[PDB]
Write a protein that binds this ligand. Structure first.
Ligand SMILES: CC(C)=C[C@H]1[C@H](C(=O)Nc2ccc(-c3ncccn3)c(Br)n2)C1(C)C
Ligand SMILES: CC(C)=C[C@H]1[C@H](C(=O)Nc2ccc(-c3ncccn3)c(Br)n2)C1(C)C
Lengths: 472, 472
């Protein structure tokens, strides 16, 4: 009872912390610019510092779990995250802020992968694993909405006070991490230093190239050089992993078609969800003119609906195949994305027009999330959960930017076609506002079209409700 | 008053009669084969003579209404259909049945397209036209189900009495149409005999080739010759229509993207509806073992649901665009088809596994069909409505076989994949029955894919509610 609650909260705390930090950091960018006197490059670098280390230290963090221990790695990561958040709060110049953000991203990349391995190992297959997966999914949304609310609330005094909010809750997690999580005293495995180094180099180079491409121009020497470095590092990693004991990423796993389909669905679904949340935030905080507080408190129905959906999916996964639940959730998600696409324009009441799509989509996402997570880590084995979980988190965090960039490009092209301007929102006339509203409602259609493929690829799962939701 | 009801029922009764006769002809084939000792070729000729005469002379029937008179043409078509129905029952040799069916199909082709023209040119734009369209679409399914019931319950004594049920219906049509509909009083036009003859012979050649394809083969010289003749006839028709005084198929109004998209949507939607009806009837009769009478009794809720959907759509079209209603109906129908594809197999109870999908699909079809046809008959002209209606009915009745053949091919391939057998379903064991059940449940997914492409392509309609459902 109490032990299970403590264990699931300790496992899910890292996702809550990371999402809260990201949301609060993105909310209070321009007060930071005013106080620190930063340029556009500094504004980009503040967010880029997190992503560089988050992406460049994913597989390594997944592998160190067997090298040292999962519990020790979890507390180490949470402690580093808290210390680097304190450094972010105390940071006085641009260099200190960048260093602190890089350290916090290092802690996130060393702590997040181990959470999925912990949820796989601590609880065996059965109802306990289902409930743990539901809690793990719910913590992310709860953290996102809470971070949005607190960041909006703390916009009146200073941006420094916002980072310190990450200190107490994290400490609580540490306390829980010291009690519920146990150690099996299993034999300690080794690490493939060459493969891990190659993977880290390739990931860091790719992330740096992707971030610096649009900002400094494409094919600007640095961009192509970083791309070539990433390609060479990936090729060397693939060559090395062919005959290396305890691979960083086992390629022979990806032969099964069930797992390939599941992972591709994970990538696409993560991209769609990230694009949806970014677009809805921009539309609510830009077009309708809602403040940060109202935008934050308007997503509580989303949290409640997603929790209800996750609970229902956890209850019903023990008898129904994962593809059925995935398509069932997608049905309501696609209904909401169309209702919003057709009957949303500036000047509509919140209650009868905006909250119902939120509730329907949240319920659909609640049913959709659990079966994919259960299928990803199904029948994997202890000595191999690490890389699978690391790849799952990597794909979820990687699908986002590409789809978001495509949607923003479509919206910009539509706005240019309607007769608007690409300037700032705060210096816009009525015609440009109408053009932007129509462009956003048009981009929702492309998001739904992407969801079409996301769901159609999920018809080839093949898993049965006896390999993911029963004991042994 | 009573005049409105009389007009709408008289207009739709031709669709009712055609659908009922087609259903009762499909039902009573084995009895005719036993009685007349006809081979498979005889049955194929019997089923295909009506199709040949219905497709070959459709455009001529739609065009002669302007030169002769719409009311007079409808009267003549109904009388010819009644006489042919009387002749069909009292037959002694194969030739008599063939010629009676040919005459009946000729009459149906002459009379059916004039119904939509009468709807357009008799009831002014507004609520009256909406109600007329709703009832016109409703009694098609009403006639389908009542003809299925009559054929099931009447073929237990004598097959000849099945073809004698059309006489009272034809008599009430002739009386009501003579009493209610009134003369157009328009100046008589002139007919382009050469173009009409070319189009009629091209359509006849195409239908004959399609009929003789499966019976003979795809390599036989007869099929190649028929196809070449059809292509040459189409070339002659299109080249002569360059400077036709009263073109049979005007190409000058096909420069509107909305109209072309609407016509393609009509084609694909009609194909999907025909395929779904045929497949569900075959599934109910073959696998579940239901009798014809039980199937007829079990589809009355489909009629009721379609009526409810039409009633709601007629009122809703006054304020919303065709796109929104079409997509909502497609949403409900997609949900119903997915539920059928997943949770259906032999041995299930009838009540909570077969009524809800039927009702939801009926509501969706009702909400979907009305906006499409109002879009089809919107803004054409008093001198070109006939050809437009003829093209609409031609595409609606032509889309069926094209997709039904593909669906049946997929079903047979899937059946052979699991290792079933080909032939009669009554002589199979449990293995082949299970294989064929899985094949039908798999083909439902392809029908759903056809529906989703239908909706995606109908997303580009672009009409305005004012031009379709607003008066003056
Ligand atoms: C051909 C076919 C069966 C289409 C199905 C799509 C679907 O079911 N689409 C879907 C399903 C699930 C998710 C999702 N969302 C968040 C997290 C995980 N999964 C998403 Br974006 N789209 C629709 C309902 C249109
Ligand atoms: C991208 C997009 C907007 C997809 C929409 C499809 C749709 O809305 N599909 C649809 C819509 C209408 C009809 C129909 N059915 C009978 C008679 C007339 N129309 C049919 Br088959 N499918 C779905 C709900 C998946």
């Amino acid at each position: 009872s109490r032990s299970f609650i403590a264990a699931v909260i300790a496992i899910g705390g890292m996702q809550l912390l990371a999402t809260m930090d990201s949301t609060v950091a993105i909310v209070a960018l321009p007060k930071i610019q005013n106080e620190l006197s930063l340029s556009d490059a500094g504004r980009s670098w503040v967010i880029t510092a997190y992503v560089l280390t988050f992406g460049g230290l994913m597989l390594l963090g997944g592998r160190l779990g067997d090298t040292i221990g999962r519990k020790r790695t979890f507390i180490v990561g949470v402690a580093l995250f808290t210390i680097s958040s304190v450094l972010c709060a105390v940071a006085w110049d641009e260099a200190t802020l960048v260093i602190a953000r890089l350290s916090q991203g290092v802690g996130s990349a060393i702590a997040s992968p181990t959470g999925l391995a912990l949820v796989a190992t601590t609880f065996p297959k059965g109802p306990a694993r289902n409930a743990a997966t539901a809690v793990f999914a719910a913590m992310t949304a709860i953290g996102s909405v809470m971070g949005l609310v607190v960041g909006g609330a703390l916009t009146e005094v200073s941006w420094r006070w916002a980072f310190l909010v990450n200190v107490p809750i994290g400490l609580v997690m540490i306390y829980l991490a010291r009690t519920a999580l146990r150690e099996t005293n299993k034999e300690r495995m080794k690490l493939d230093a060459t493969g891990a180094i190659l993977a880290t180099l390739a990931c860091t180079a790719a992330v740096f190239a992707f971030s610096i491409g649009p900002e400094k121009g494409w094919m600007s020497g640095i961009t192509i050089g970083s791309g070539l470095v990433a390609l060479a590092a990936a090729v060397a990693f693939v060559i090395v992993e062919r005959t290396a004991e305890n691979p960083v990423v086992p390629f022979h796993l990806f032969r099964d078609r069930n797992r390939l389909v599941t992972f591709s669905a994970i990538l696409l679904a993560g991209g769609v969800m990230f694009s949806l949340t970014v677009c809805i935030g921009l539309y609510v905080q830009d077009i309708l003119g809602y403040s940060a507080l109202r935008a934050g408190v308007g997503f509580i129905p989303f949290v409640i609906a997603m929790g209800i959906g996750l609970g229902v999916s956890s209850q019903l996964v023990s008898r129904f195949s994962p593809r059925v639940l995935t398509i069932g959730g997608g049905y309501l998600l696609f209904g909401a994305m169309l209702y919003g696409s057709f009957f949303m324009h500036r000047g509509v009441p919140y209650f009868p027009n905006l909250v119902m799509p939120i509730v329907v989509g949240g319920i659909g996402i609640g049913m959709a999330v659990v079966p994919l997570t259960l299928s990803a880590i199904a029948g994997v084995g202890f000595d191999q959960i690490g890389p699978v979980s690391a790849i799952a988190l990597m794909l979820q965090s990687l699908g986002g930017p590409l789809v978001l960039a495509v949607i923003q490009a479509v919206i910009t092209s539509r706005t240019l076609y309607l007769g608007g301007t690409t300037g700032p929102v705060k210096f816009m006339n009525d015609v440009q506002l109408a053009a932007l509203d129509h462009a956003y409602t048009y981009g929702l259609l492309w998001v739904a079209g992407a969801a079409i493929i996301v769901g159609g690829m999920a018809l080839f799962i093949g898993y049965t409700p006896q390999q993911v939701a029963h004991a042994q």
